[PDB]
Design a binder for this molecule. Structure first.
Ligand code: CL
Ligand code: CL
Ligand code: CL
Ligand code: CL
Ligand code: CL
Ligand code: NA
Length: 129
């Protein structure tokens, strides 16, 4: 599923991401835009052999199991394919664990490089929430 901007904002808000660990909704929408272009089915392979999955491009080295990343962990205890569902619940739940591990949203390179320090509120402007 490819989400609309306000559609994804509303879905993230219902799943408790607005101000989760101090990160306003706009941060999460911005990160999803630049990580996946709002596409739940996005995948990208990394040079170390791990793969990033879903709307927030969660990585198989640490967070999910895809059965092909040797010596990896599965900290969200889910198959990576679950992160590609049109229902974003698994992605959101796993992201909550990632953002809580100490480095905040800096875990997401695109957020650090393209959202951090910008007017992220702009990403939810005009939305009915
Ligand atoms: Cl915001
Ligand atoms: Cl694996
Ligand atoms: Cl393969
Ligand atoms: Cl959803
Ligand atoms: Cl933080
Ligand atoms: Na893994």
């Amino acid at each position: 599923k490819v989400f609309g901007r306000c559609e994804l904002a509303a879905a993230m808000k219902r799943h408790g991401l607005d101000n989760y660990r101090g990160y306003s909704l706009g941060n999460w929408v911005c990160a999803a835009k630049f990580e996946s272009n709002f596409n739940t089915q996005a995948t990208n392979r990394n040079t170390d052999g791990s793969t990033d999955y879903g709307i927030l491009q969660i990585n198989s080295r640490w967070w999910c199991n895809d059965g092909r990343t040797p010596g990896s962990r599965n900290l969200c205890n889910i198959p990576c394919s679950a992160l590609l569902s049109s229902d974003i619940t698994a992605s959101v739940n796993c992201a909550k664990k990632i953002v809580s591990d100490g480095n905040g949203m800096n875990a997401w390179v695109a957020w650090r490089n393209r959202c951090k320090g910008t007017d992220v509120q702009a990403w939810i402007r005009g939305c009915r929430l």
